[model samples]
Target: SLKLTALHFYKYSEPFKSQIVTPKVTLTHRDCLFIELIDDKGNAYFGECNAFQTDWYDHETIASVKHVIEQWFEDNRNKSFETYEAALKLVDSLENTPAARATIVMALYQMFHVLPSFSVAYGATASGLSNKQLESLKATKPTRIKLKWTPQIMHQIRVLRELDFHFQLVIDANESLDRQDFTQLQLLAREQVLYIEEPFKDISMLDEVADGTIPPIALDEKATSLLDIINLIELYNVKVVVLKPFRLGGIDKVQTAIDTLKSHGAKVVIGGMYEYGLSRYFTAMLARKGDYPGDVTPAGYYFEQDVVAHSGILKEGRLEFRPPLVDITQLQPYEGHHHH
Candidate 1:
């Protein structure tokens, strides 16, 4: 057992909307949670739980994770584990919750050794962008751009092509469309989009379009677990899978999922829930280790102001890691733990 030590949670607001637009929901000014975990060794690690309840989780998800942490403290206080594997085994034997798993997994990684360097691609979402804003964003030259599949999406594509024919596009239908639009899907294929994600609310709709000539189809909300990823490939012939660490358990599970996807011949891309510093940092490490392209840029770059003093750096459409210069405790004052 690994002893439970300290926990702190803080809420930070983004200056602008941390946009993830779909036909069903449009979010802005997303408030995010920054959680800090400390062990008996005085080693500290951080976890971020900043997902939307409307689509993926419930309102009490964070609170429930806190409850799990409190229970962990009661069960394992003053205990020690000889190895990292033993610590991970303890986490596995505990109750299963994505947030709790993510918290502990990150804490363990930080306790072990140095994190790795990752090469990340820059992605700008065209969800709420005006034509003017879209043009301006294109000037910055993102590695890939995320757009919502819509009636006017072709026009948007034409605009991008005119600016530069080679910019990769990642389209998210957000299940806003009634069903798979094979016509537009083929059109996007001709335009050479990287992939289209969640084109239909029912993932089974993908099977109908599987035989069509279209760009690779990726799953976002649909690929919630390993089984889901396997099913998406076997049934729908999906070509790409977006893996979100927080949503799919933690680093351990994410690594397994990525390996499974590769074994199945499906491409894996790291996605985020607009996480803050700590989670983004860990995601970057995973990207480096796996040599996978990711959309893990620190949300601060998209916001008016960021909570962390040091954040991800973008150069030539790739994100570079800048190790945190300020003590994380100074960024947000620690609130006392709710020990049981």
Candidate 2:
């Protein structure tokens, strides 16, 4: 066992190459706080905080993640176990801070070399779906395609089908739909769509219809704990679950949830929080464990520069995984304020 000696937080605003326009938010840049854990031997391990500028996704924000972690160091200054179990117990003591907890969990996963990395689910998005974009997608041949749900979502699906290709489809309604939308969603069965993600604002509205009535609804529910997921599965019989690592906290219980979900005859899709290179690597390993492709595209897909200089290539809708190299010099220390 190594003696965990030092902990440092680097705040990074990874600039986007272009406006990452999505259903709910348009991000010009992503704000992340990277946690660096140092062993007595001077080896460094890395983790990333995937908090956003606002709580559009969940309760934690960039500032909150920073403050929570800053206080954690004050209480637990030196940790020797530095194992995944240590990380788990450390996270459990803190309440309702998945994004904050995940940053530390990530560092531990890297330190123990326990982070899973072999499984890669090739993924792509159809943000614009222009003729050129279609050609680009055709060239990569993604195993699954996730799209933003719009009133014209049907048209996009129809056109993608026009290419005479077969692949799974996932739609993120981003809590914009209601029970009224189920009527239209029912039509997706004919299209062989996988599931409609987070379609209703109040997820309970999904219970209005009995199971198997509409296209299988996948949920990105505000799942803070594993029980939250169990309720979604047992109460709603949610068959398809879209899990974001940072939102769920980290790999420990999320792995347990994936195993439990599969044993319950449910499917899991690992999702992302617009993560940087280091966190992206962690998600790929989790995606493999879940046996599904996720929103885990390559590092350069969304950013002008990755947090690490970890360059990856996708071949025929598969991600090539390698341990990320640390060039974290771009990261700046937190100043207790949001500059952007």
Candidate 3:
């Protein structure tokens, strides 16, 4: 039986920037949800809910999800769950919003130690990177640099190649390319990139581009569901799948996708949204525990300040976690929407 004593919700705003120009929605200030769950045993765990885009999920939606979580625990405060699996099944029955679902799942993982480690993670530039920034990053000797696709993408790639550094390149189009960009796509393939993510907005066009033109592509926005992941692999024969834990429903779903993608001979790139607190902790833990070699960009690098008193360190592209100094669940309640 599973029992909960308390649930806390908070809203935090952190400044984030892209290396290049702003995307359709510039994320200068990232405001997202931070949750704390306490069990009857006096143990507490934390989780985070951060969406990629507001258009996909607005503040109201998040608040509604928060309410649903509160109501769930309120109704079952004294109930006992037989096992974590049973508890997860209850979570499955709660609601359909992916972010909301992720919040609970993450908390449970922390609560029970379901999936959890540290290695060197990769880095990415949201807006894109300038020549000087690239050089500065090169000075640090990052193993790989994930670049968002831009009109001057070729120029950027050329710069990287000319620098003669040891770092690999990961080009992300964010589903921005189209038929007109076919030639450029081909040019990217010829460069032997690590992999291009969401080269086209229309996933249907993936096969056309991979018909021997573009390099092996990775799926991001296009791989929203389990079925989407299967199709992306079986049909488009994508070489990589970018796994964002929260976006994909939670740790369980993300692990399933990773195993599935690996079975199909595809590479798994554990990507991250600009996140902090336990969400960042959870993401790093997953990568470390699974020994995943992907981009787990250290959020602290981009944040003006961290919600937690202590956090993991991202030095020279590798991340090392430190036990948090402040207990997240014990923090003062953040005056956001929390239903009794």
Candidate 4:
């Protein structure tokens, strides 16, 4: 059996301009960043950072942040946290200021033998669900998957509905359309997509939903940090806010954002980037607090191999990773800090 042996990092800069499709600014290829962890025996997990359009760091700088994570592992590999309070403090330490979030979290997680599924475990969805398991989850922890609305999507909705799969819809709009384009949303309303996400140019469009023109909406790219969360809640009357921890600098900021939203009665759900087990696990933990369905589509959600493990993919809408432990002897420093 293959085992996770070592880890590496890389900065995946896009070659051309890209857009999140859900609205906001058009990204100029350098807008996204990626980090990964790999075991020497051959297990892998990925992490990503998309701190909104106004983020100060670039992909290279984002890549450099991993050094702090690596250093934390080396330094604290021997530190002790014996009591429950000590464990809680360790979680709090993960947020020295939200900006150092990625590194601190990676270190803290390594220190504590915790897995992401403490919120919702990956359930081996790649192979579908057994009768008992499916019934248990449907009766207990059913995740509402939101699909991007399109003509092809419309077809999928019909198919999924036929299969008795109901989903809360997330319409990733181009946000460049006029009133006529918004009129198109009536189709989804008829389809009964409970929520629409980032459907207009900015959060200002959320008023349209509140005004009874559209359905309830969820904000994604529009709310990136703690400040942005406040503005979304106060200014836009954002009903539900999606929390992507990395976008808010790390887990601490995300915690603050969640607390603020909960106080205001705004629904909170965790979102996911294309990452490996560590990031996915952390996202699961975040989701546990709010206990809302997350957007983690699982490893098998796509055809490509993200990490080296098939188990990492979703089986029955859940992902499971019992990463094997292994040691590496030929670990060499990256030459001139080459991206992984």
- Measured against the true structure, the TM-scores of the candidates, in listed sequence, are 0.85, 0.90, 0.87, 0.61
Model 1 spans > 4 angstroms off: 1-3, 17-29, 51-60, 93-95, 288-292, 324-340
Q: What is candidate 1's lDDT per residue for 74-188, written digit by digit as tens?
A: 6765677777777777777543577677776777766666765555766667655577776757666776677776688998777666666356778877777654466767767
Collision pairs in model 2:
none
Q: Whole-model lDDT for model 4 versus the true structure?
A: 0.51
Judge candidate 2 against the unseen true structure and give its global Cα lDDT, from 0 to 1.
0.75
Query: lDDT by residue for model 2 over 1-340, one digit each (tens)?
Result: 6666787877788677667776578888787778887888899887888888887766788878888988887776666564557656866876478788888888877766643335375777777678888887888888888888888888988888776566778887878886667767877767777877778878778768776767877777655566777777778857778777787778666787888888877788887767788888777777876645787877677776776765346765678877777685666777656453
Backbone clashes counted, model 4? 24
lDDT of 4 at 318: 49
Please give the ranking of all candidate structures by TM-score, highest first, separated by commas. 2, 3, 1, 4
lDDT for each of the candidates? 0.67, 0.75, 0.68, 0.51
lDDT preference between candidates 2 and 4, better one: 2
Question: For candidate 4, lDDT tens digit of each residue in 165-257?
Answer: 444444454344345556666556676665666777755655454345555667777776777777767776556778887666666567777
How many clashes show up in model 1? 1
Q: Cα lDDT for residue 4, model 3?
A: 77
